[PDB]
Amino acid sequence: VRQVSKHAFSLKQLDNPARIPPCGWKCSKCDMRENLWLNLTDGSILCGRRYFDGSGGNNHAVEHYRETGYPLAVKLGTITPDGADVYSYDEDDMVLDPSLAEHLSHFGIDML
Ligand SMILES: O=C(O)CCc1nnc(-c2ccccc2)o1
Numbered sequence: 001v002r003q004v005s006k007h008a009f010s011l012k013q014l015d016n017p018a019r020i021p022p023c024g025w026k027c028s029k030c031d032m033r034e035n036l037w038l039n040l041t042d043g044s045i046l047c048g049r050r051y052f053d054g055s056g057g058n059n060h061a062v063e064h065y066r067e068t069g070y071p072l073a074v075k076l077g078t079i080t081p082d083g084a085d086v087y088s089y090d091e092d093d094m095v096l097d098p099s100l101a102e103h104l105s106h107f108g109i110d111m112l
């Protein structure tokens with residue numbers, strides 16, 4: 001089961017966020033249009049890790065986490081009225097963000 005992230009309740013979200021569109025995103029560091037993560041602190045849009053089997057992205061989201069320490073990201077294309085896929089770099093797991101609606105509203109995302 002996905003547990004509540006310890007970061008969720010008091011997550012920092014930076015002022016002057018981008019309006020994140022409902023489709024058509026790309027990694028800001030490469031050509032990936034699949035497997036994109038929206039960082040819930042800064043609204044960066046970056047691709048997922050390269051898996052050891054050769055699958056996945058080009059590690060741009062994790063590289064960004066190593067620089068910023070911003071732990072929570074939502075997988076774009078998984079946001080629905082029932083929730084979303086939220087990952088914590090810090091806890092290294094998929095997690096629950098009980099403030100997800102609020103976190104997404106920051107970026108002009110109405111999950112409903
Ligand atoms: O790829 C990224 O940068 C962010 C998403 C991500 N990194 N690792 C995982 C993971 C780890 C444990 C369980 C399930 C998924 O997901």
Ligand SMILES: [Zn+2]
Pocket residue numbers: 027028029030031032046047057058059060061
């Ligand atoms: Zn990338």
